[PDB]
């Protein structure tokens, strides 16, 4: 999100791609998962696509 | 020396209320 905000030009599309093979990045801790979920929701509201 | 963790070492009166129904059946 910080990287997206720095750009000064008008951005029609905002997109992020996740190249990973770990379906359970945080299995031991649930607070980290909740924070990640909240951040992902906030990014989606901002208008950032996630793939 | 140690550290900051070591030093911190972190009768009366009874009351009754009556409640009487005031319906046709009573």
């Amino acid at each position: 999100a910080n990287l997206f905000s720095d750009v000064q030009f008008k951005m029609s599309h905002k997109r992020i791609m996740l190249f990973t093979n770990e379906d359970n990045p945080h299995g031991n801790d649930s607070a980290k998962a909740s924070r990640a979920r909240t951040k992902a929701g906030d990014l989606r509201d901002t208008g950032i696509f996630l793939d | 020396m140690s550290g900051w963790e070591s030093y911190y070492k972190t009768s009366g009166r009874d009351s009754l209320i009556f409640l009487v129904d005031a319906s046709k059946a009573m």
Partner: protein, 422 residues
């Protein structure tokens, strides 16, 4: 090696939260006292080897009492600016619920709203110590005075990312300067030291209050009196005889014959004799500075016993005629109080100890220096008789002293009582 660099900010935040949560004043005082005692023990342990230390409780005291901050200029960020910065930095939606809650807070304080917003969006354990927080706040203030906002934003971002929800709430409260805990300034100062409030009133600089009054045992009297220094002697208060018995809770007292001599203090240290007046004026030239010079100093060098090397005395200076063996009203000196003997300081000790130790300072010798005549009385008849005797002797009046009274320079009242006909 400041102590504040070893104390996490989380501990201070937790202590403040515990103080706020507690209802009774006893629990709040206990928490504050325990935190202060731990800090003092750690300070003693750390500075075992160092001789001169400027470290004190100031780093935490300034944060606990933001309303007394004067070293730091205005931050320039009020509630609205803080809300705007939080919205911008956290990248929250402009129209989202969090942004509306933060901005529309009915200009349930803003700190609670910020805490609720950041609770599910921040870490659970911070890593910023008190020193780092103080440095960041200093940078923010200095940059605000320099008209620069980019570095202010950077510092706020660092604080946000390196702090938990409770720490952020307390930091917001500190910045707003509205830290409410249920205990006022007076209670905190009393818990800190027994003579902090009046000292802070005397001087509006918090750093010295925390530095000088570090050791609880060392009272204000010891620090107020220093070698080769001119302090301000206190004075008695005029009172009526009819209620004299009510001035001291009907306790035994000391009656002294008032002398019409100028109040003056002196310090003896080996072959050095320093002199000062009540207003601080220096008159060492009148009586000289060494036993080989002057008129009065040469005749008192032998009076002091060998056991006395360094001493400080205060009294009244008058003029004496040996031919008629009389005292002429407006060289002889009278001694009625000792402020410091040897390394130990007698300021803390009550008047009884001072009177007891006066006899061991020097052997009285009429003509040059002696001890002012005085007696012990506990009845109004004794006071009347002493007043009549003084009037028959042309003395102005009577001095009434309470043995339990302590030395409190620059204050009016206490056991120092002046009785004059009226």
């Amino acid at each position: 090696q400041t102590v504040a660099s070893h104390v996490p900010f989380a501990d201070l935040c937790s202590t403040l939260e515990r103080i706020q949560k507690s209802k009774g004043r006893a629990e709040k005082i206990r928490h504050f006292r325990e935190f202060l005692d731990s800090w003092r023990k750690f300070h003693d342990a750390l500075h075992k080897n160092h001789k001169d230390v400027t470290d004190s409780f100031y780093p935490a005291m300034r944060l606990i009492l933001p309303q007394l901050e004067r070293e730091r200029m205005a931050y320039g960020i009020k509630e609205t600016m803080l809300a705007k910065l939080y919205i911008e930095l956290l990248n929250l939606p402009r129209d989202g619920k969090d942004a509306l809650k933060l901005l529309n807070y009915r200009t349930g304080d803003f700190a609670m709203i910020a805490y609720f917003v950041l609770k599910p969006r921040c870490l659970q354990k911070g890593s910023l110590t008190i020193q780092q927080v103080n440095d960041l706040l200093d940078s923010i203030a200095s940059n605000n005075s320099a008209k620069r906002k980019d570095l202010i934003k950077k510092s706020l971002l660092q604080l946000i990312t390196q702090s938990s929800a409770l720490e952020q709430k307390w930091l917001i409260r500190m910045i707003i300067k509205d830290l409410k805990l249920g205990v006022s300034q007076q209670t905190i100062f009393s818990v800190f030291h027994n003579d902090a409030a009046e000292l802070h009133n005397v001087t509006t600089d918090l750093e010295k209050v925390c530095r000088q009054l570090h050791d609880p045992s060392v009272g204000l009297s010891d620090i107020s009196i220093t070698l080769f220094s001119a302090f301000k002697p206190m004075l008695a208060a005029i009172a009526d005889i009819e209620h004299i018995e009510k001035d001291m809770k009907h306790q035994s007292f000391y009656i002294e014959t008032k002398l019409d001599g100028e109040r003056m203090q002196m310090h003896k240290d080996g072959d050095v004799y320093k002199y000062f007046s009540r207003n601080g004026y220096n008159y060492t030239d009148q009586f000289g500075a060494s036993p080989t010079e002057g008129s009065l100093t040469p005749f008192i060098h032998n009076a002091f016993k060998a056991d006395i090397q360094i001493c400080i005395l205060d009294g009244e200076m008058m003029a004496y005629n040996p031919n008629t063996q009389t005292f002429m009203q407006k060289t002889c000196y009278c001694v009625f109080d000792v402020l410091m003997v040897n390394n130990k300081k007698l300021g803390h000790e009550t008047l009884r100890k001072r009177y007891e130790i006066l006899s061991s300072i020097f052997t009285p010798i009429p003509g040059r220096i002696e001890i002012v005549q005085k007696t012990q009385a506990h009845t109004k008849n004794e006071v009347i008789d002493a007043l009549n005797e003084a009037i028959d002797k042309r003395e102005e009046g009577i001095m009434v002293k309470q043995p339990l009274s302590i030395y409190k320079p620059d204050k009016r009242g206490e056991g120092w009582l002046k009785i004059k006909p009226e």
